[PDB]
Amino acid sequence: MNPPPPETSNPNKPKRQTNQLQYLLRVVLKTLWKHQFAWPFQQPVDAVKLNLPDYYKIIKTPMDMGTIKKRLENNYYWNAQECIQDFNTMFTNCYIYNKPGDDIVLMAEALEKLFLQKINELPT
Ligand SMILES: CCn1c2c(c(=O)[nH]c1=O)[C@H](c1ccc(C)cc1)C1=C(CN(CC3CCN(Cc4ccc([N+](=O)[O-])cc4)CC3)C1=O)N2
Ligand code: NA
């Protein structure tokens, strides 16, 4: 079975709008979302439908760009650091669960290279 997916809204979580967060949504997420390698990462990992039965025995902090996209669009975050941490978690899960040189790890590295490309231009 799959665990419950990460929340994308919470009536008890304080939130802000900042230029850094606008940048993360409009530049970083939108650029990675359209990438030809984005598709494994655009929704929570369905370990049943994808035939990764051990996935959630290993990965205890799931994250994906579909969740991140909705958190940004819903204004879930307080600061840019929280959003970067979610991206970092997504990539980490891929590198931890899969083995070095796995095709999916090669995909994640290309997306991560682009992610860092855009973060290097994050505004003040
Ligand atoms: C980030 C999580 N994640 C992932 C995977 C993983 O390995 N590790 C992870 O962490 C898996 C993975 C993703 C990409 C690549 C290049 C290799 C493996 C993996 C995903 C998504 N998905 C969808 C399909 C599954 C069906 N198809 C074979 C296939 C084709 C056609 C037919 N038909 O025509 O009928 C039948 C069967 C291969 C891909 C995966 O396979 N996510
Ligand atoms: Na911020």
Side-chain angles (χ1 to χ4, degrees):
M1 300 150 42
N2 292 304
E7 59 177 25
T8 58
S9 64
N10 183 323
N12 291 310
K13 184 184 182 303
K15 63 171 81 76
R16 287 193 307 185
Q17 288 194 1
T18 73
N19 265 301
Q20 277 216 286
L21 279 164
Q22 281 283 37
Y23 186 86
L24 277 156
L25 173 56
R26 302 301 307 198
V27 175
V28 183
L29 183 287
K30 291 189 85 80
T31 294
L32 296 182
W33 189 263
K34 295 270 145 43
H35 195 274
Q36 67 165 328
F37 289 170
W39 62 270
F41 308 97
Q42 285 170 327
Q43 56 285 312
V45 173
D46 184 335
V48 167
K49 275 335 172 153
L50 294 180
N51 182 27
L52 315 161
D54 55 337
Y55 188 87
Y56 289 110
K57 304 166 200 343
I58 303 108
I59 300 309
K60 300 303 187 185
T61 81
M63 200 31 80
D64 64 282
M65 281 181 327
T67 298
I68 294 167
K69 174 178 181 302
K70 289 319 297 166
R71 286 179 176 196
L72 285 160
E73 293 172 342
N74 299 345
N75 217 326
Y76 174 85
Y77 292 119
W78 180 260
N79 64 26
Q81 292 54 47
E82 289 180 330
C83 176
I84 294 170
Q85 172 181 88
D86 284 346
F87 274 109
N88 281 344
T89 294
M90 190 174 72
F91 290 116
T92 289
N93 294 341
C94 185
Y95 300 142
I96 293 320
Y97 174 75
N98 302 284
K99 295 135 82 173
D102 260 350
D103 279 349
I104 188 69
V105 161
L106 305 182
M107 296 164 82
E109 301 190 338
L111 286 177
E112 191 181 19
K113 183 190 226 263
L114 186 56
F115 168 74
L116 295 169
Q117 276 186 225
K118 299 303 188 187
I119 296 295
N120 277 3
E121 284 148 344
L122 194 65
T124 55

